[PDB]
C-alpha cells in the first residue's frame, strides 16, 4: 500500500516546527514529496518539494524559514519550519509526486497534521454525559451524547463503543470559547428500547495531552 503518515503539535511562537512524513509502498529515490498547508477556513498553500534526486524548491516568501531533509533508509522526509507565528497555524500535508519533476500527479496525500502556534498551554478535556431522558426521546428514538469541554489545542477525536456505533453519530466542529479553550459535543440517536440493555460509551482521544477518556452515558 502507498501511504504517507505524518501527530498534532502545539508550537510556541518564534520556536521551530518539525514535521515528519513517513512513506511506504514506494522509494524516496523514485518519487518527490510536496508539502502543502491549509489555514483554518482558507485555501491550500504550497510550501516546498524535495525531488527524488534531492533537488529542492521552496515557496519564495517562506524560503528562509523552511528546510527539508530526506532519510531513504527510514523512508522519511522531514520539513523544518523556524520562527513560527500564530498566522502559521494550519493543517500541514505531505503528498507524493508520481512522475518526474516536469510531469507529475499529486496522487497520494498524508492525513494532515494540525499545527497550532500559540503561547497557550496544553490542557486535556473534561468529558461529561449528555444523558438520554424523556426530554431527548422522539417517538421510539432517543438522543444521547458526550460534552467534551475545555481542551487545548485542537483536535480531539470521538468514537462510540470503540467504533462499533457509527450510524446516526454527529460530532460537531469544536467551538473556541473566550478563555482560549475549545469545547465540542458528540451525539447519537438510538432506539429508546435499547436504553436499559445497550451500553453507550464515548471514546475521547486528545493526543496533544496524551489524554484518553472513556465515559459511559447512563440513562436517566
Amino acid at each position: 500500500q502507498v501511504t504517507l503518515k505524518e501527530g498534532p503539535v502545539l508550537v510556541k511562537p518564534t520556536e521551530t516546527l518539525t514535521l515528519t512524513c513517513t512513506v511506504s509502498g514506494f522509494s524516496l529515490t523514485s518519487y518527490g514529496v510536496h508539502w502543502i498547508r491549509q489555514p483554518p477556513g482558507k485555501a491550500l498553500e504550497w510550501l516546498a518539494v524535495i525531488w527524488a534526486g534531492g533537488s529542492i524548491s521552496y515557496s519564495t516568501s517562506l524560503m528562509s524559514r523552511l528546510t527539508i531533509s530526506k532519510d531513504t533508509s527510514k523512508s522519511q522526509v522531514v520539513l523544518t519550519m523556524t520562527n513560527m507565528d500564530p498566522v502559521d497555524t494550519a493543517t500541514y500535508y505531505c503528498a507524493r509526486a508520481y512522475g518526474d519533476y516536469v510531469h507529475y500527479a499529486m496522487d497520494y496525500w498524508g492525513q494532515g497534521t494540525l499545527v497550532t502556534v500559540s503561547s497557550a498551554s496544553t490542557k486535556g478535556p473534561s468529558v461529561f454525559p449528555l444523558a438520554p431522558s424523556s426530554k431527548s426521546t422522539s417517538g421510539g428514538t432517543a438522543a444521547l451524547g458526550c460534552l467534551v469541554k475545555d481542551y487545548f489545542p485542537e483536535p480531539v477525536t470521538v468514537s462510540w463503543n470503540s467504533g462499533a456505533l457509527t450510524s446516526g453519530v454527529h460530532t460537531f466542529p469544536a467551538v473556541l470559547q473566550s478563555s482560549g479553550l475549545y469545547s465540542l459535543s458528540s451525539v447519537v440517536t438510538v432506539p429508546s428500547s435499547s436504553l436499559g440493555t445497550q451500553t453507550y460509551i464515548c471514546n475521547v482521544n486528545h493526543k496533544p495531552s496524551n489524554t484518553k477518556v472513556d465515559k459511559k452515558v447512563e440513562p436517566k
Binding site: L44, W46, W109, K135, T141, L147, T171, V175, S185
Partner: protein, 213 residues
Amino acid sequence: DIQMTQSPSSLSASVGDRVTITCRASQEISGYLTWLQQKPGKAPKLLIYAASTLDSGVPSRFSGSGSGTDFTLTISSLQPEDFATYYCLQYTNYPLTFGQGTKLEIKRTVAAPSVFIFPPSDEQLKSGTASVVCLLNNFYPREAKVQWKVDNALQSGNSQESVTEQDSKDSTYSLSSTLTLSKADYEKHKVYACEVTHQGLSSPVTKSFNRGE
C-alpha cells in the same frame, strides 16, 4: 507567482444536476493543471491531472477540459457524496499555486429538525459550571434560529452554536446550541427551554425541562 482565478466561490445544486467550475491562469500553463476534491476534515483527493486525464477510480461523471489559461471541471449527474471544496492547481512553475476554491453544497427538499434538550450533568455541576445543550437533528437548509429562555427570560451572549457538514447520504445538517451558565445561576432558576425556528416548522418548536425533575 502565477495567479489562479477560480469561479464561482460557492455553488448550490441538486442531485443529478450538471455543475461547472472554471479556473483561469494569469499566464500560459499548457496542460499542467490538476483538479482536487477536498471533503471537510480530510486530505484533498486527486480528480484530474494534465488538465483532462481522469485519475483511475474517479467516477466518469467528473471531466476536465482546457489548455493554456482557461480550464473547466464538469460534474455530470451530481451525487450527494460530491459535496466538497474543489481546487484547481497549476504545476508548470514554482511556486505551485492553487485557485482559492469552490464550495459545492447539495440542494435538497426542506426537512424540519427533530429537537432534543439535555440538562447539565451532575458531574459538570460538581465542578461549578452548567452547560445546557439543545440539539437540532437532520434538517435542511442550514439556516436555523435557536433562542434560549430561562424562566421565560430571553438569553443573550451566553450561548454558542456549531453545525455539522452536510450528510454524505441524505444531505441534511445537524446543529448544537450550548447555553453555559454559572452553577449559582443554574441553581437559582427552574425552567430551561430552547425555542427553534426553521423553514420546515410551521410554528416554533420549544423543548424544555424543569431543573431537578
